[PDB]
Amino acid sequence: LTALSPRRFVVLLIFSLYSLVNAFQWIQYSIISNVFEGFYGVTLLHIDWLSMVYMLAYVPLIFPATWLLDTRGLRLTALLGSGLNCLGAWIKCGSVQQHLFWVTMLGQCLCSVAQVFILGLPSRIASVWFGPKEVSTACATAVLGNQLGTAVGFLLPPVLVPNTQNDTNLLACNISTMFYGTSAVATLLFILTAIAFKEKPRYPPSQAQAALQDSPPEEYSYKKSIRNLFKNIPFVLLLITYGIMTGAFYSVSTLLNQMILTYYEGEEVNAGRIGLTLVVAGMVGSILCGLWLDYTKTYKQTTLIVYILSFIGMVIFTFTLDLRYIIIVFVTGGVLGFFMTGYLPLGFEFAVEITYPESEGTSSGLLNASAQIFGILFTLAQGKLTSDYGPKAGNIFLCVWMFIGIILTALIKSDLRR
Ligand SMILES: C[N+](C)(C)CCO
């Protein structure tokens, strides 16, 4: 007996809203990094770690959290993710004093742990609550909610918190409004989850879901699955290429304020708009994807073309940032974002034919973890190069790693159409 309950929209809306808030808090410091660097009296490296703790916490916690989801259930993961997102936000509101950077780092740490319960959720929520014809749309909608949070996180902080470095009293007042506004919204979404989020529908939405309930998986042996995946040569290549592409996006997002403010001083508002253009353009590219994969093309071909076009965009972005024209940075950011962040759902869909029998949870956990590892390596390396030699040295570093990703992409032997 398959039935569709009106609660699926409520569940999807609630998750996509507090998944939006989680991605908002990840980047809310980096887009105004020069504001927090002077307010907290720390170096730029301290602020970049407010964005890197999201990546660092994901790698060692993803698989224990995945085990929790498969054993306890969907509701507990939703409560923990939205609950920790709210709890971390309230800690940040208590750190609006100049000598309380470690308090906002502690609050950022709690938000980072919340993401482990959020980033892989869209696939589970879509399958559990939506029918066969709506699974892809529901999963894509929840995933895009995380990207929308990053786009909002680029735009709002430059508007909410102007760089009034000379008057620190108003600087603390503006930061309180952002932190209090975030925690108020995070608390509201936590309360809604505790009321409306449910373990499962009264009836299975899809025939596959009905069989899944009739076949309790019990254990899964992640260690067996993770070691069966590292013997798949195309998947190992896909793990590296996906991490490089997403890691470059993470590093560019973290250091976007540093590059723009190097040339265009006092351009925090436009820097926030540039990041919004990058993320929004790639959101459209994700929606347009699928139309890219025509009935003659394969996932491997589409991945190779997008990877090449993303690398070209990175080169064009690298050598146009020094031209002292903020307008072309908007155009180059949109072109770069259209391919760099529009690749994110493409890499996940390519890991379906490569990894057919093994559960999507392990492959998703590995692909996401690879992005976190590369994002840390890229942010640390590009940040070091930018702080010593300028934005061009850091941006050139990403292009070389993007070229390596092209070579590894072409070496994958896997042909299967849409
Ligand atoms: C997924 N985010 C882009 C929000 C951060 C990962 O570290």
From Swiss-Prot:
Changing residue 394 to R: In RETSNS; uncertain significance; abolished localization to the plasma membrane, leading to decreased heme exporter activity. Changing residue 69 to V: In RETSNS; uncertain significance. Keywords: Cell membrane, Disease variant, Epilepsy, Erythrocyte maturation, Glycoprotein, Intellectual disability, Membrane, Mitochondrion, Neurodegeneration, Neuropathy, Phosphoprotein, Receptor, Retinitis pigmentosa, Transmembrane, Transmembrane helix, Transport. The chain crosses the membrane at residues 1-25, 44-71, 74-93, 101-129, 135-160, 167-196, 233-263, 268-296, 299-321, 325-354, 363-388, 391-413. Changing residue 154 to V: In NEDMISH; mild phenotype; uncertain significance. Found all hematopoietic tissues including peripheral blood lymphocytes. Some expression is found in pancreas and kidney. Glycans are attached at residue 166. One of its GO terms (biological process) is multicellular organism growth. It comes from the Eukaryota. Residues 72-73, 130-134, 197-232, 297-298, 355-362 are cytoplasmic. One of its GO terms (molecular function) is heme transmembrane transporter activity. One of its GO terms (cellular component) is plasma membrane. Changing residue 250 to A: Reduced transport of choline and ethanolamine. This is Choline/ethanolamine transporter FLVCR1. The gene is FLVCR1.
